[PDB]
Design a protein around this ligand. Structure first.
Ligand SMILES: CCCCCCCCO[C@@H]1O[C@@H](C)[C@@H](O)[C@@H](O[C@H]2O[C@H](C)[C@@H](O)[C@H](O)[C@@H]2O)[C@@H]1O[C@H]1O[C@H](CO)[C@H](O)[C@H](O)[C@H]1O
Ligand SMILES: [Ca+2]
Ligand SMILES: [Ca+2]
Ligand SMILES: [Mg+2]
Ligand SMILES: [Mg+2]
Ligand SMILES: [Mg+2]
Ligand SMILES: [Mg+2]
Ligand SMILES: [Mg+2]
Length: 279
């Protein structure tokens, strides 16, 4: 569905969450395994969720046509090549793809899972109803870029951004308030900017990336193989966090605003479809 970012319309159930992919695999030739159980597996081709999300099923990776991994900042890298090499696995949909292999397909981190057991932060920032609400209000641009990052999730890049662009007039620093109201302001604030700093965190993919896109705010991300399959989305990819200027962003805004984008990727259906196609 090639269309311009400004034309992004959203429904309540369109937001991508790794949970939605779990239930779609548990209910409806596709196994969802928390990446942690793939990373710290005791057997080579046998894994399981060990009760996580009430899933005691044993997975025989030698017999699964499609494997889905997520709910984690862990990446898929050479450590999992022996699984990727399995001939019966036709597709590996994963969060944080960190290997140049055509069998591995990235899917968006999306939005936090509100239904995480006994976690208010998840119940707060996992609230897609708020994101949907703000996306319906008039997008009155208050400033160019929006900065609200926890530097301690990936200091190497994040600290560099703050050291450089916090003092810029065309940048707004967002306050840190973990609450239903603090979240709403955080969404309304990011909604009111053309861009938003979306650097990688503990994991390569970040929720800020997709919160920004659902609000039609262009996220700024550093180039990474894990993002090499999202270049058909209105994301501003940068070689480094240096020499970003109001002119450069004003240039990329007009370009990114004039282009057509595969915005259907932002919808859960695109990934339901892709999992059904391969399975
Ligand atoms: C003040 C407390 C800070 C956190 C302390 C714990 C450090 C590890 O926490 C990891 O790094 C953080 C910077 C977050 O990204 C965190 O994310 C989770 O919580 C967010 C609020 C949600 O938004 C996300 O969806 C996701 O549930 C992420 O945890 C996931 O990845 C891990 C591998 O790294 C494990 O697989 C774990 O099981 C997963 O949940
Ligand atoms: Ca566009
Ligand atoms: Ca540069
Ligand atoms: Mg717009
Ligand atoms: Mg790499
Ligand atoms: Mg990662
Ligand atoms: Mg990739
Ligand atoms: Mg045009």
């Amino acid at each position: 569905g090639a269309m311009k970012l400004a034309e992004l319309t959203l429904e309540s159930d369109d937001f991508i969450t790794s949970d939605k992919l779990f239930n779609f695999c548990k209910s409806t030739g596709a196994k969802y395994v928390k990446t942690d159980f793939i990373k710290f597996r005791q057997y080579q081709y046998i894994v399981s969720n060990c009760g996580w999300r009430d899933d005691t099923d044993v997975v025989f990776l030698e017999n699964t046509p499609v494997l889905v991994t997520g709910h984690s900042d862990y990446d898929i890298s050479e450590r999992e090549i022996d699984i990727i090499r399995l001939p019966n696995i036709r597709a590996w949909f994963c969060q944080n793809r960190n290997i140049p292999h055509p069998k591995v397909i990235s899917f968006p981190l999306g939005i936090t899972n509100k239904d995480e057991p006994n976690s208010e932060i998840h119940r707060i920032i996992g609230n897609t109803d708020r994101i949907l609400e703000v996306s319906k209000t008039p997008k009155e641009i208050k400033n160019l870029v929006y900065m609200n990052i926890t530097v301690k999730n990936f200091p190497e890049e994040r600290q560099r951004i703050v050291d450089l662009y916090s003092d810029k007039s065309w940048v707004t620093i967002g306050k840190g308030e973990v609450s239903e109201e603090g979240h709403r302001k955080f969404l309304e604030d990011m909604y009111a900017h053309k861009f938003c700093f979306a650097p990688r965190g503990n994991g390569i993919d970040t929720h800020r990336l997709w919160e920004s896109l659902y609000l039609r705010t262009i996220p700024i991300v550093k180039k990474h193989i894990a993002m090499e399959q999202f270049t058909d989305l209105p994301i501003l990819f940068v070689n480094d966090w240096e020499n970003i200027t109001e002119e450069y962003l004003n240039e990329q805004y007009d370009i990114i605003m004039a282009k057509d984008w595969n915005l259907d990727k932002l919808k859960i259906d695109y990934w339901y479809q892709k999992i059904l196609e391969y399975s």
